[PDB]
Amino acid sequence: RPAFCLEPPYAGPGKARIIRYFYNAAAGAAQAFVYGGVRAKRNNFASAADALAACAA
């Protein structure tokens, strides 16, 4: 998988309240987190499906 997939989820400093998905490598699963709308890292997806296709491929 890309190194990006090993990164902890990044809420960032934004104030929005958007559920996004990240690949949790140690868990072997895509998991929800709250994304703030600003300065996203690359382990950040619209759905569990999109996280798994990028990283559990």
Domains of the chain plus CATH, in order, are 1-57 (4.10.410.10)
Cited resolution, angstroms = 2.3
CA 40 – CA 50 distance, rounded (Å): 15
Q: State the residue for tokens 């960032």.
A: 12
Check residue 46 and report its DSSP letter.
S
Residue 5 near residue 57, CB atoms below 8 Å: no
Sorted by sequence, the CB contacts under 8 Å of residue 32 that are 6+ apart come out as 19, 20, 21
CA 31 – CA 33 distance, rounded (Å): 7
Q: Provide the residue count of the chain.
A: 57
Residue 34 near residue 16, CB atoms below 8 Å: no
CA 32 – CA 24 distance, rounded (Å): 10
Residue 25 burial by Cβ neighbours in a 10 Å radius (0-12, 13-18, 19+) = middle
Tokens describing residue 18:
């958007």
Tokens describing residue 57:
């491929």
Amino acid at 17: R
